[PDB]
Design a protein around this ligand. Structure first.
Ligand SMILES: *C/C=C(C)/C=C/C=C(C)/C=C/C1=C(C)CCCC1(C)C
Length: 137
């Protein structure tokens, strides 16, 4: 399918819960929740290869990967991790991360194109699932 595009968030649920699992304290959790309101995702997909720029008001970060090939990124709370993205279906991919040092909750993320033109992105820590919905700008 075509993940490429310029996505703006319309909904973001359970983000505060996820940052709690990772040890973020209350006052900074509320600030990150407000930051997530302004999130944009830019995707260039050529075949199996994705270039993904995730950004808020004061921060931007680039995730370049190929389906099936290990790469390195960070978790939602900054720790470096090895990642591997695989398809689940035609329009959904899931990424499993493993920490490069130490220990912590089991983190992962998914991205899915819907039949209705939305990009749905979920990030998980152990049992807790944050769900984020975007539309093309
Ligand atoms: C495929 C999409 C991915 C891997 C997106 C990952 C997004 C994040 C790690 C986002 C982090 C943050 C914000 C969106 C704003 C609030 C604070 C952060 C740093 C947890």
């Amino acid at each position: 399918p075509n993940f490429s595009g310029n996505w703006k968030i319309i909904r973001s649920e359970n983000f505060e819960e996820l940052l709690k699992v990772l040890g973020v304290n209350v006052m900074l959790r509320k600030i990150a929740v407000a930051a997530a309101s302004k999130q944009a995702v830019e995707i260039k997909q050529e075949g199996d290869t994705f270039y993904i720029k995730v950004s808020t008001t004061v921060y931007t970060t680039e995730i370049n990967f190929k389906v099936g090939e290990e790469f390195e990124e960070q978790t939602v709370d900054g720790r470096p991790c090895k990642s591997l993205v695989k398809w689940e279906s035609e329009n959904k991919m899931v990424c499993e991360q493993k920490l490069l040092k130490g220990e912590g909750p089991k983190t992962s993320w998914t991205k899915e194109l819907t039949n209705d033109g939305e990009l749905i992105e979920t990030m998980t820590a152990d049992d807790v699932v944050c769900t984020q919905v975007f539309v093309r700008e």
